[model samples]
Target: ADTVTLPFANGERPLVMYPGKRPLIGLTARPPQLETPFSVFDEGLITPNDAFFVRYHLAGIPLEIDPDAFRLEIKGKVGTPLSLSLQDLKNDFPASEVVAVNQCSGNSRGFVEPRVGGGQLANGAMGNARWRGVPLKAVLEKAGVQAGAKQVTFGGLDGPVIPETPDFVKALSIDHATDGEVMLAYSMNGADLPWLNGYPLRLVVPGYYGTYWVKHLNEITVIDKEFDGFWMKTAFRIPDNACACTEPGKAPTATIPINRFDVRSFITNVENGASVKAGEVPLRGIAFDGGYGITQVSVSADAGKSWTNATLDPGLGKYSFRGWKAVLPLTKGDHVLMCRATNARGETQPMQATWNPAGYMRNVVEATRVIAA
Candidate 1:
């Protein structure tokens, strides 16, 4: 009986449930793309494990996993190859924890101007959580990364059913991989990760897009050169220009793989078409960026003509979502409330939505429509 209507047209996604998950807005069925409802963000800074967003590239995701029999293998460009079991991962390495936001590269894609083709998401394909597990660097060091190592590649246990399809894999530069920030998280928000969000193990590339966070992670390979995998070469690319965009129908002459997130903020406390009290609307919402950190959030009440700063809550981490709030006085009629985020690096959400064929990185200032009674 539950359904959530996103702000954009054709964004009326249904609320459904998977095993170990709460009622989430279902975007796709086969690969199981579930989005966290915007209301979920209003609950708190740390997204609940059962309510976290879910996204899968391949349809043949693992439904059942034998944690006792699972072995994570590390090989290539290493003096010693190690096949460590789940128990070994928990027992052998130092446990590391981080609070980070895991957002899809194409989050809020549905709102892209000129209407691009892709998952028509509406600000729900992201979540922040506390992740706990062994550091990927620790495991790589145990495997003895050799001098020639250039890129660290990761593959999961679940992939395509057909041989023609490329197995879902992602890679990171050796320096970024061994920076002691990335983790092989087995737990999220102080609980064992939900299966849909990667149960036994998943890569946690803090500040990076969700594509690099391979779920059900099982293999690690350190290579001597760059990986030109299909996911890297063809998929998940954006215009290499400063704006990472094109002129709607126009394609970029050159493109680069999508990477860090742009700053984004939202007014979660109000719905798009809700009727509220005439005065004093208590507002609260969130903002986040790539790891530079969200410094300030400004609220615009009379459209974008004027703005005031919203007080930001104590941050969980630079990579985690920063909650911000302010009250608005409304007399009557429709009011458009907007929010924008500024990061530590001084990057702020754009006033206009960026356009690209892939609909990647759609972090424009978000507006919420409301009617005051």
Candidate 2:
């Protein structure tokens, strides 16, 4: 197992350990997609650099990038089209840091009923870390965004091997790009970016899905119109609705690009189907939402029948994972424990499962079953 290590022990797929990376769960091969071990969430609020999830859209990732020779080109719809080296990027802009979560849109695809076809991943395709970089607003300001600038597009070093295949590019609205929270991250968790994560540079789009966070980022383009690329116009879309959903097994008629994450909470301390002694025990978990802050986490030991508020840890930031703890009074029987989170924006996880064709944004009130002694 050179790519990842299976949970509890090992698995059918060999989880190989890469340099500067822990043995993450192996989802598949080729593009080096790695899922963080689920238990890592139980250890702490901040996910370590080595255990952060890894995702790549293309197989031809630039593994051996020369930092000294690297240049980040900022062009299009700007007064100054400039190319700057990595060192100049650091020296020119003041460094800033923020703790946030980077999660794949199809994070819990495996859990989707009817067995979807995309990456059959569990709930591990996400991690929280301290990202350090220059505010993208500063760079766009230096570039002097034109009045006609409508959207900002981004591209990385990785691309499709086939000439006919569309290159992986993502875009953000002009206002969102200049929101000042988005960053051109050079470091993760206080350490230099890991090669597998994004060696030279990565775009840290706080509170947005990981797809928008371009890895090995080297280009920034300000376009006058909305980005009409395949990645923007076709892929990564959700049903154009408040819930971003449609009838189960039915395709959405109208769709739009997936963006901010909905509120989600998980019971990290207890494993599903694990045995717990009948008595008072501590229950712990993590909760997060988009830029809106997490206000409360309600725990239900009897499925969704009864709810109790959990003591929340002091929040690291609005976009960061917030840890929560509660006392579970277990009896001698099978107890289905569930946790639902609510954010400052008043968005809450649905009690019933919501579905879409892409199997994206699988946020629902999840239950952890434990057999009582």
Candidate 3:
């Protein structure tokens, strides 16, 4: 019998943490939403494929896929619709790779004050990997996108068990989809993706939220207007304001699709009630924004009274985690540690997190308390 650990208020052992995993904390089983423990971020920049997080909207994920039998269809508003196999994807087009972070829009949903309904994830629903595949533009060009094409819609092989549930589909502007960087990735890290992580193929949209990076991707449709699907028009949306924030009960009259990530950082090494030797206490964590790149990560040991700039290790790219660490002298007492990041675009984390009904896009400064004895 698997020993129960990491108690949750709901009294469900399966949802608290992974049964026998270090960095994985299981949030749900059927549809599968796993979070990366904050400690894993202290180790490195790029998260390992196994330690990487997993999220799915439907429980009927294709657990087994035959690489030989699978076919990806590129239909809709194109002069030459295409039906390409995995072999054609690798053999016919120019293979490319991009090191990017795929983060769920509702990553820090657990931290919302007036809690909403959803995955209730912490900050672990994100990971950075070297995605290898063929450029999306290369495939779209093969299909010869028509002049009136407006958006590119993508759909995964997974579908709803109940007919009432909406099919999981997402879209991007044709210009964004065919900009030559969006890819249909076949491999993560250096190996074929695991069954749970979209084995045969997945969409890799660099600098975009994970919602747009559909997994088990099988369909690419070029449409003549903005997509009006439930996933596109209603779900994964935020306020159309500059900050994407609104008063608690005052909803925004306008909403917009979520895309790029916001500037954020976390203190992963020292958790609450952590004990350390009386000496140089090293504070470590990771920080990242969309694609503008992280400029600096500041750490505060004395509860934000005074902040000291930390050292950032050379990162993989603008879209990968930038690790930062700061060493402070221990005086044998409780010390509060806080971290915040600034991006090259001059965006920094707000002291308070913005709230929305869907609980998306949380980038507030994070703090942890530790005791040094």
For candidate 1, write residues 1-373 as lDDT tens digits: 7887887788787899888788989999989999887788899998898888999988999988889999999999999999999889889889999999999998888878788888888778899999999988899988889997899999997888787898898889999999999999999989888888887899999988999999999999999999999998889988999899899889999998888887888888887788889898888999888899788999987778888889999888898889888887877888888998898779998887779999898888887788898
lDDT of 1 at 70: 91
- CA lDDT of each candidate? 0.89, 0.88, 0.85
**What's the lDDT of the predicted structure labeled candidate 2?**
0.88
Model 1 — TM-score against the truth? 0.96
Q: Which of candidates 1 and 3 reaches a greater lDDT? A: 1
Per-residue lDDT value at 67 in model 2: 89
Candidate 2 C-alpha lDDT tens digits along 115-219 = 577876778899999999999999999999999789999999988878688998999999999989999999898888988888789899888889999988999
* Native-to-model Cα distance after best TM-score fit, residue 301 in candidate 2, in Å: 0.7
Residue 82's lDDT in candidate 2: 81
Error of 3 at 194 (Å): 1.2
lDDT per residue (tens digit) for residues 188-273 in model 3: 99988766678789999998899999888899999999999999998988999888878765677899999889888887777888
Off by over 4 Å in 3: 1-23
- Best candidate per lDDT, number? 1
Q: Candidate 3 vs. truth: CA RMSD?
A: 2.4
